Amino acid sequence: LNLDSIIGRLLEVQGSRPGKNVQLTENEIRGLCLKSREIFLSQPILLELEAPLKICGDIHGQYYDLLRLFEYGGFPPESNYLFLGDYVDRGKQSLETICLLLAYKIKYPENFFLLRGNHECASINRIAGFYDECKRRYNIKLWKTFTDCFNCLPIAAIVDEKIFCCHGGLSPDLQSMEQIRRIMRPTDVPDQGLLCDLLWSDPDKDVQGWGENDRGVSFTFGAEVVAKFLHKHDLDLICRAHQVVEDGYEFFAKRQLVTLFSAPNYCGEFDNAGAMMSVDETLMCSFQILKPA
Amino acid sequence: XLXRXXX
Ligand SMILES: [Cl-]
Ligand SMILES: [Mn+2]
Ligand SMILES: [Mn+2]
């Protein structure tokens, strides 16, 4: 597996007209999937990470925006990175996006981290674009290879014992971090339970306790669930993604939770920026922002 | 609005 050749070809299109594809070989992509899967399985399902690092939310195949985020924040390994999931679906270049992220995981496995989003799941990405992209540009066998890799992604991270990171949010079944560590891999995303909620739940300003989630799965949770969670586990901040936010980032529960969304111009309704959160050595948080077009 | 599984 010639990782530097793969990374070089993926980065070659910087400065091209947004849209230019990078077409790796099928054998190269299979190799990225197989090697990264091995690495994911060798590292904990609940990652224990150190600052400083940059944290990114949903990308959804917006490859040229991923390149902008790296341009702004430093290409790996100049900065350490944690991505919160939702790499594929919706956008035009899910393949380039996930291939670059997997290549960086293999090259910098202790300095580059990828969590699982709810779109890293065959049931969802079958319908939301990634299956179609794989079928068009490669074949369905490669989509299964991607799925096998996604089934091994870690689910949450704690930065310096203070920032709890996951794609979606909290779970009514999450009482101990050991419950997360006990999750076996490979696994699909279930339609209910702890793993489901970590990838699917949402905070809500108008919910007291746990509420029904408009997505048809998992729950919403209120500001006091957040406060109680941080107190119980001696944490300072929940960092999650999963929801489009106009500013690219949005605080909740008196700045006890932050939502990051890194794909600008995601929706037709409102314009949205994409934001990446810089966490300095003392856990102070700032933002680098792709403003909407 | 892309379909509330989610604009
Ligand atoms: Cl609440
Ligand atoms: Mn999501
Ligand atoms: Mn998403």
Length of chain B: 7
State residue A195 phi and psi, 5-degree precision. Answer: -60, -40
**Using the beta-carbon criterion (under 8 Å), do A215 and B2 form an inter-chain contact?**
no
Residues sharing a CB contact under 8 Å with residue A145, sequence separation 6 or more, in sequence order: A29, A30, A33, A34
Residue entry with tokens 């947004």:
A18
Q: Does domain A1-293 sit in CATH 3.40.50.620? A: no
Residue A34 C-alpha, separation from nearest chain B C-alpha, in angstroms: 29
Strand partners of residue A274? A290
**Using the beta-carbon criterion (under 8 Å), do B1 and A216 form an inter-chain contact?**
no
| Residues of A labelled catalytic | 119
Identify the experimental approach: X-ray
Q: Measured between alpha carbons, how far is A131 from A128 in angstroms, rounded to an integer?
A: 8
Residues sharing a CB contact under 8 Å with residue A29, sequence separation 6 or more, in sequence order: A95, A99, A138, A142, A145
Number of other residues whose CB lies within 10 A of the CB of residue A55: 30
Name the strands in the sheet holding A237-240, side by side, starting at the edge strand that comes first in the sequence.
A46-49, A156-159, A163-166, A237-240, A257-260, A249-252
Residue entry with tokens 């993604």:
A241
Nearest to B7 among A128, A214, A269 (CB): A269
Q: Contact, A280 vs A242, CB < 8 A?
A: no
Residues in chain A with CB shorter than 8 Å from the CB of B2 are 90, 128, 267
- For residue A276, the number of C-alpha atoms closer than 13 Å in the C-beta half-sphere is 24
Number of other residues whose CB lies within 10 A of the CB of residue A182: 11
Q: Contact, A120 vs A240, CB < 8 A?
A: no
Q: Measured between alpha carbons, how far is A238 from A255 in angstroms, rounded to an integer?
A: 9
Q: Contact, A153 vs A120, CB < 8 A?
A: yes
SS3 A6: helix
Q: Measured between alpha carbons, how far is A24 from A277 in angstroms, rounded to an integer?
A: 30
